[PDB]
Amino acid sequence: QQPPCFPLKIPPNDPRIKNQADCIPFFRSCPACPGSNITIRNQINALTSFVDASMVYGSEEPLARNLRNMSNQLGLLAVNQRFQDNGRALLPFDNLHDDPCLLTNRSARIPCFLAGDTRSSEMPELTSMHTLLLREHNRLATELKSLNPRWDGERLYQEARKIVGAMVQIITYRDYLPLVLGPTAMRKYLPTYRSYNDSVDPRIANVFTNAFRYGHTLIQPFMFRLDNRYQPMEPNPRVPLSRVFFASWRVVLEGGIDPILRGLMATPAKLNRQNQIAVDEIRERLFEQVMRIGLDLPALNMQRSRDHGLPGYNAWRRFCGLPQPETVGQLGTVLRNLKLARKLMEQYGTPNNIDIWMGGVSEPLKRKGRVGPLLACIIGTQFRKLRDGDRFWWENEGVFSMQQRQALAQISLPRIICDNTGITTVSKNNIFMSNSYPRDFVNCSTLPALNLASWRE
Amino acid sequence: QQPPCFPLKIPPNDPRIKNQADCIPFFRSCPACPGSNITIRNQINALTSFVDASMVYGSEEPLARNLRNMSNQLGLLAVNQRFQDNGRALLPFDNLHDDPCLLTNRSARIPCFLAGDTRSSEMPELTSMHTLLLREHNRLATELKSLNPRWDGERLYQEARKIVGAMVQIITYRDYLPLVLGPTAMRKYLPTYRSYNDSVDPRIANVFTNAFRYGHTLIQPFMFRLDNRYQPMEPNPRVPLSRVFFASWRVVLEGGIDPILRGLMATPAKLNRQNQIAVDEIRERLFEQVMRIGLDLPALNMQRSRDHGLPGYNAWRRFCGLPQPETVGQLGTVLRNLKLARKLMEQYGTPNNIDIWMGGVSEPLKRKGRVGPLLACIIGTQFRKLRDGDRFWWENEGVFSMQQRQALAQISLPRIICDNTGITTVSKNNIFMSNSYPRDFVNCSTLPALNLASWRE
Amino acid sequence: DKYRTITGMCNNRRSPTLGASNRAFVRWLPAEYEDGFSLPYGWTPGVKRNGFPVALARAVSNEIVRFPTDQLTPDQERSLMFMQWGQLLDHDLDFTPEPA
Amino acid sequence: DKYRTITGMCNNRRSPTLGASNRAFVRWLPAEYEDGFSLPYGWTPGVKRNGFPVALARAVSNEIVRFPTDQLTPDQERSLMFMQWGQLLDHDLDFTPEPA
Amino acid sequence: RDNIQGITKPAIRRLARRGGVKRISGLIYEETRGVLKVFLENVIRDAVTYTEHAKRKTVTAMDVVYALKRQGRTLYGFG
Amino acid sequence: RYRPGTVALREIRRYQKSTELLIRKLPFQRLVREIAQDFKTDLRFQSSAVMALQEASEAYLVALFEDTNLCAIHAKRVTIMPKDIQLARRIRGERA
Amino acid sequence: AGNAARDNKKTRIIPRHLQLAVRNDEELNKLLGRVTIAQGGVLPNIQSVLLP
Ligand SMILES: *[C@@H]1O[C@H](CO[C@@H]2O[C@@H](C)[C@@H](O)[C@@H](O)[C@@H]2O)[C@@H](O[C@@H]2O[C@H](CO)[C@@H](O[C@@H]3O[C@H](CO[C@H]4O[C@H](CO)[C@@H](O)[C@H](O)[C@@H]4O)[C@@H](O)[C@H](O[C@H]4O[C@H](CO)[C@@H](O)[C@H](O)[C@@H]4O)[C@@H]3O)[C@H](O)[C@H]2NC(C)=O)[C@H](O)[C@H]1NC(C)=O
Ligand SMILES: *[C@@H]1O[C@H](CO[C@@H]2O[C@@H](C)[C@@H](O)[C@@H](O)[C@@H]2O)[C@@H](O[C@@H]2O[C@H](CO)[C@@H](O[C@@H]3O[C@H](CO[C@H]4O[C@H](CO)[C@@H](O)[C@H](O)[C@@H]4O)[C@@H](O)[C@H](O)[C@@H]3O)[C@H](O)[C@H]2NC(C)=O)[C@H](O)[C@H]1NC(C)=O
Ligand code: HEM
Numbered sequence A, B: 001q002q003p004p005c006f007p008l009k010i011p012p013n014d015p016r017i018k019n020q021a022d023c024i025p026f027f028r029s030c031p032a033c034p035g036s037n038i039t040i041r042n043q044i045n046a047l048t049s050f051v052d053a054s055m056v057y058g059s060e061e062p063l064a065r066n067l068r069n070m071s072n073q074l075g076l077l078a079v080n081q082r083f084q085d086n087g088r089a090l091l092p093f094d095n096l097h098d099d100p101c102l103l104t105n106r107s108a109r110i111p112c113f114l115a116g117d118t119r120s121s122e123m124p125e126l127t128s129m130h131t132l133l134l135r136e137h138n139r140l141a142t143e144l145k146s147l148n149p150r151w152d153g154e155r156l157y158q159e160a161r162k163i164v165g166a167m168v169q170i171i172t173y174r175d176y177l178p179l180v181l182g183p184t185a186m187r188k189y190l191p192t193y194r195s196y197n198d199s200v201d202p203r204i205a206n207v208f209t210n211a212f213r214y215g216h217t218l219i220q221p222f223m224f225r226l227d228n229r230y231q232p233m234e235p236n237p238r239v240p241l242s243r244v245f246f247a248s249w250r251v252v253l254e255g256g257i258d259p260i261l262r263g264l265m266a267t268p269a270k271l272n273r274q275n276q277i278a279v280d281e282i283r284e285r286l287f288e289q290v291m292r293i294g295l296d297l298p299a300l301n302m303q304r305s306r307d308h309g310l311p312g313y314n315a316w317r318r319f320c321g322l323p324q325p326e327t328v329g330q331l332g333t334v335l336r337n338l339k340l341a342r343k344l345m346e347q348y349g350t351p352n353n354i355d356i357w358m359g360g361v362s363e364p365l366k367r368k369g370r371v372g373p374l375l376a377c378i379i380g381t382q383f384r385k386l387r388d389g390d391r392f393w394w395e396n397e398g399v400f401s402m403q404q405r406q407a408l409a410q411i412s413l414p415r416i417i418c419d420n421t422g423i424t425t426v427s428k429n430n431i432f433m434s435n436s437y438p439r440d441f442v443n444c445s446t447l448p449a450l451n452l453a454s455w456r457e
Numbered sequence C, D: 001d002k003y004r005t006i007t008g009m010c011n012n013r014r015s016p017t018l019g020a021s022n023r024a025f026v027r028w029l030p031a032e033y034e035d036g037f038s039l040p041y042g043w044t045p046g047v048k049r050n051g052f053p054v055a056l057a058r059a060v061s062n063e064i065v066r067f068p069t070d071q072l073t074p075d076q077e078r079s080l081m082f083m084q085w086g087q088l089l090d091h092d093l094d095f096t097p098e099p100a
Numbered sequence E: 001r002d003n004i005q006g007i008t009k010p011a012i013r014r015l016a017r018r019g020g021v022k023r024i025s026g027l028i029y030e031e032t033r034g035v036l037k038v039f040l041e042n043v044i045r046d047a048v049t050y051t052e053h054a055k056r057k058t059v060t061a062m063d064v065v066y067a068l069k070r071q072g073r074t075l076y077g078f079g
Numbered sequence F: 001r002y003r004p005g006t007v008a009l010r011e012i013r014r015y016q017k018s019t020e021l022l023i024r025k026l027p028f029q030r031l032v033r034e035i036a037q038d039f040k041t042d043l044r045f046q047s048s049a050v051m052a053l054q055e056a057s058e059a060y061l062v063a064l065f066e067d068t069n070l071c072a073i074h075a076k077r078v079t080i081m082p083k084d085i086q087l088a089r090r091i092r093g094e095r096a
Numbered sequence G: 001a002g003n004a005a006r007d008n009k010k011t012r013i014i015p016r017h018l019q020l021a022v023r024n025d026e027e028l029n030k031l032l033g034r035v036t037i038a039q040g041g042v043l044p045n046i047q048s049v050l051l052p
């Protein structure tokens, strides 16, 4: 347990790990001030605290410059020089001292992908999203260059970056959050846009990095791929999630990203229930091939919350203005469950010691939502701070013209997917809701395309 | 101009300092993290952020242990072993490498006094208050020893310390704050005590160290001493303030602390007006004897606020919910003065750049108060946080019994003044309000003394 | 100010470092460490958190989160794209580095 | 847990270091430095604040605070013990150290 | 004279909306009219008694204020 | 077209921000005169008296409707019903 | 009342401001618990149950 190692102790009678002397690997976060007898320990955020599509353009000058294709004056982004997806762009490769992508399968010899985020190679889905965004940026830059032949590479790159960031913000705040918080919490915590506060702090809260891990309860135990007719693509249509962690060779040498996107569109998510929190695939076989032994994602979340020194469940309930339980009965009433409340009370000993993540995922879901009142409050507060404190918000005056805003308000994720890939059948509007084929799938020729005529100069 | 030095520049046509190459000495505060690029600069609070009579018992274990009378078992505080004030205790002397008290009077050779704070010898009034508190602690310890003969030294010391802290808290929150904030701000920011709220942060805000400097506007340009008949005591009935800085020899060798306390109790303060902010003694002759040139207390306050990186006047007005001026007319309306608003606009250029101290002291005073609405907001918030977030508050259950609380509720400053000092005539209740003789002075034979019969074991 | 910066600097004119990259988080609540400043709960065996022993995170996951995988149910009103966009937005927002 | 601690620690059970001595201040508003983290306004000539030049502190103290001492107005409702107790309570609350 | 019907359905709807009511059933208008009639009858009876004691034929605002005050419904702004 | 519940919320926001009277003055004056006709005949009313009666009646009805809304919410409902008004009046001690 | 008017961006004082001042202070609301202020309106309050 010598620093900076904080391994997870193994309790007795553990179903998986029989040896008590073993421990789960764990590394403490980097302190803000390395070595101090005065300052309270604080963590470091290495990425911009804005919704600015930093996943594709990076967050530092050297990496961002390396990500650009500085060989012509088209203002494009670097693509893979060795592999193609049916004649379409692919993410550039990365050079690392230790590469888990090569460790996953030594026969293929496919290194990890290079993008604005170092974790963009965890699964084929993230690589598919990053490649889709890169293709969209390249198409926007090419269209702008054709429309405005007098511009240079830097201007085209900046304009395409601005458009991509605006699209990300629009899609997020118009489709994702209303389905997360629910209409009541959406109206309570994220009202209509008024103007630009410069007095709102846009920094990311420490608790948020845990409160946003609720998606770990939406993880399905399989990765699904579908062919053109939205049928199970063979061989291996449903592949285990333990065999896709850091496996980039499933993108280059397994038919590209189109089947992955098709399976992404036409597969229901996992519902969060008080007796079904997280699947065993991520709870017992996380990074099994990459590491010596598998990890435990909920346990890792709890240990990270403890490492950051986040307060308990009751402190965050009081911070959000909600009643704070103290006994078994009050906790059961709050959770609308007595068996789960009894188990939590036995394990922790008092509600004040319940971890933020576990308490948040134990709370019942809101009406037409996916989070409890505490998690919904935290997420809504953080995203409202991000939106109101951002000077370059698309709806803010002086950033986009009225015609540009009107054109941008008509975008949609299915339009981007159908334009940037070979997919001809895409789901209806609110892609985060349609999951049944062919109940709510259209021919993609009816969806309007973004009009760039307002960008002429 | 090299770190940590932050010298004050001299404008052209300065009335005092004709030369421009000279500068006022100034040192930047010690940062919380000595050298970093990830963390914003923060300052250090070297004292306990509680109303716990930390002026006398220190805030560090070595100093607290060094301040006691370890030679006996009576649990008293160390007193001066060379001088006495007509048979009464005096503060112990201190050993410093560069003693400033010796420079004021080379013939006397009286070093600075030693107490729980390093700035206890700035003027004889602070020394008198410290000596009075030490005398009260010693008297309480002696009375407790007489009442309970079986107690040890440490128990007596702790009990006397608790009584002194409770007395200080009672005096402050019952007499001083209502006369500062005024009834409206006192009721708004300091409501009735309910219980101990462990979720209140009791730390001292950074702006408070600049918001509480309003007392620099109440300084009279003289020090007044009165004899037993409250007549001007000769020689030197009124001493210029520029000659009493760091002059401890005026305490030991000029009759003691009786005339200083008498002058404090029976002399009007200086009213704060928008055309008379601070006198010229603290503005042009601060620490004149000690250093080469005098300092500028308002300029020092403003430069210290700049060093701490505090926001401007408008940001703090927005923080407290008050409207934010933007133009000269709005500033004149807010300040209820046009000449001052015009001067401020000419000097700064915009209300957002006005420093916190100047903005706070320029505002018109509250009704029956002594600070503007912004300073009242900041001070009330800070003191409510201090009271509610303190576990050992004198009204908190378990700290004192009901009989002890009833006995402590009857304490007052005049009783302490005329109990441990040769003063026989003291002001009526609310010492801070009565300033005329003999209109509102009593014989000290009518004020009941503190009853310790409830401390029996 | 025609376009965004790449490091987030100077987005807020009053405080350019606010919301930038490689900067410390903002603490909505004071930290709760075992020794007070820089030690987590469970680092030192035998210590208690608010009068109760600290439970093992792995044990908590074992006795609560675990459930048979054949009882899993799907969501009839969501899709996997929901989870994927959640992850993408999260990777957009924050990332906490750790030593190698 | 019968009397106070000299250092001030353990006053808050959840976070023992809250309200102790030799600890960093709490910021109610984000800091506003010249470069963003570790530079005061007016450190370097030619740099303006919020689009306006930074006024020399001595200059404004000369042109605003200064007033002839002869016209001092005594306070008929307060005494000097007001200021003295204010200073004493201040010396209780806070003290910002500087290097020697 | 059926002037009790002068209090229309939109007026009662506005009064309920001011009170925070979102949905209103159609059977509560008669109940509201009856309640208003009872309250007005009581207050006006007290006011008329006050006027009659003073040997007057005009019901002043002060009489109504006193009638409201004697029922624990003090009204500010009319004397 | 607007889904039900939106215009109601807009009206709630609007009428909670204004201070104007919500009952027509002439019908209320006629009702007051009709009611007062029973106790005495040939009565004269000052305008201030009618205004005070209207203000008191409106305030009483608004408070009663707030209590009725609380009663309806207690029974897990959104729609105001006469039984809620009766329960509020009985608890307050008016019809008890 | 003057603070309420200032926050409302107005100069004069009207009965609405007096009602806002009274109803937003706990002690003053308790003191004037059975008092009706003419042309005062009501405090904005919408129950969360009826919210969409
Ligand atoms: C014990 O003390 C606790 C702290 O008390 C504070 O300090 C003392 C000195 C007093 O000044 C006191 O008034 C202070 O609150 C106290 O807990 C506090 O309780 C309040 C009320 O529940 C909490 O406020 C809620 O917080 C969030 C968001 O508010 C702000 O959070 C962000 C974080 O930075 C800020 O940037 C923004 O300004 C946000 O406004 C919300 O949940 C909530 O707003 C909603 O509240 C209800 C929801 O039902 C709605 O009616 C409202 O319209 C809003 O939609 C509140 O603002 C506060 O966070 C919390 N503080 C702490 C530190 O936990 C506690 O109640 C005291 N206990 C007792 C028994 O008195
Ligand atoms: C721009 O937004 C700021 C900040 O708004 C915050 O963030 C947005 C996203 C929303 O969540 C808001 O609800 C948040 O407030 C607005 O200025 C704020 O105005 C309010 C109301 O006047 C101020 O709150 C006051 O603060 C005082 C109490 O101090 C509080 O903090 C201390 C220390 O933490 C502590 O004692 C306790 O937490 C206190 O509550 C007091 O005067 C008063 O009661 C009131 O609560 C708030 O401080 C302001 N925030 C800032 C950062 O200055 C602006 O109004 C908005 N602008 C526009 C144009 O809409
Ligand atoms: C779908 C499969 C996913 C996998 C395999 C995965 C894996 C991981 C792992 C191993 C970590 C490190 C945790 C730690 O260091 O404490 C992490 C971090 C994180 N995950 Fe996930 N995750 C997935 C989905 C999601 C989703 C959908 C979300 C949100 C909607 C999410 C939210 C987070 C957050 C906020 C962090 C931040 C941790 C930090 O910054 O230190 N995860 N992810």
Ligand code: HEM
Pocket (backbone or CB within 6 Å): B122, B123, B208, B209, B210, B212, B213, B214, B215, B216, B219, B282, B297, B300, B301, B304, D083, D084, D086, D087, D090, D094, D095, D096, D097
């Ligand atoms: C009466 C004579 C006083 C004198 C001669 C005096 C002198 C000083 C000086 C020279 C400083 C150093 C400031 C700096 O270096 O930036 C200081 C600090 C300070 N003074 Fe005064 N002061 C007096 C009274 C008061 C009073 C009555 C108050 C409040 C009611 C007060 C409030 C403060 C504060 C808050 C500080 C900052 C503390 C710190 O920086 O650690 N002063 N004083």
Ligand SMILES: *[C@@H]1O[C@H](CO)[C@@H](O)[C@H](O)[C@H]1NC(C)=O
Pocket (backbone or CB within 6 Å): B069, B071, B072, B076, B077, B078, B079, B089, B138
């Ligand atoms: C302090 O200690 C000395 C030791 O010589 C002793 O003489 C003196 O009386 C003590 N102080 C008091 C106030 O008793």
